[PDB]
Design a protein around this ligand. Structure first.
Ligand code: CL
Ligand code: CL
Lengths: 143, 144
């Protein structure tokens, strides 16, 4: 998540032991029944894309579902780009995120926090969560 | 955390998503042992106000919720006993020390709660109240 330090700067806060413990428990009991989704939504509150990837990579078992989820995320990232055209570089010299930045694969943790705390926010955590949930909805059909 | 109109990241109260998940946990698990890890994670970063919202969204379990209120009253009284204070801050505009009733959120405002939680060093009133609530839950789980 994101927290303010003693200097007043926004910086990363590691997913806590209590949050990761609960998410594992939810995965162990519910992955990937419909009931997993409200639990994921709450436990991922304030997550950066890097935190969201940590949560996804905690899922033990469910190899096939995790592959489908990844395919959905890849699709959404590419569509995001097509619906959010940008110039061939910052005119500057903050770049707009691409789909792969939103999914955490091409962006740094600092870029993620930059977007999420920009004025107005470019809510890359919330956007990635929407793609993840689209995927979870597809996967519930296997369960 | 949420961004205000001035572009600042400030505290925001317990969210609809968090509360919806908490309900669902109550509906399935209250107050079996497995409620406690879920309460602990869902209340991460909660103020005393957020924690009283969680407690007051439990439907039923009146016996349990009465035991919780007794546990909180006792821990608040013991907090006051074990944290002796002066009558008030010696310096004029200085932040007062929280008493038990401040930690339980009955005599403190949201502003004060956030003031303590973000002090340097923190006075983590949300964590303290959560400890009292979990102590109550560990008694109550014996009924379930
Ligand atoms: Cl976000
Ligand atoms: Cl706290």
């Amino acid at each position: 998540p994101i927290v303010q330090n003693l200097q007043g700067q926004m910086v990363h806060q590691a997913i806590s032991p209590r949050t990761l413990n609960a998410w594992v428990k939810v995965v162990e009991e519910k992955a990937f029944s419909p009931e997993v989704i409200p639990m994921f939504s709450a436990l991922s509150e304030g997550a950066t894309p890097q935190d969201l990837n940590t949560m996804l990579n905690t899922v033990g078992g469910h190899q096939a579902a995790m592959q489908m989820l990844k395919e959905t995320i890849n699709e959404e990232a590419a569509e995001w780009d097509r619906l959010h055209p940008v110039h061939a570089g910052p005119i500057e010299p903050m770049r707009e995120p691409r789909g792969s930045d939103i999914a955490g694969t091409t962006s740094t943790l600092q870029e993620q926090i930059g977007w999420m705390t920009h004025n107005p926010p470019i809510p890359v955590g919330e956007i990635y969560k929407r793609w993840i949930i689209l995927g979870l909805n597809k996967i519930v059909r296997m369960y």
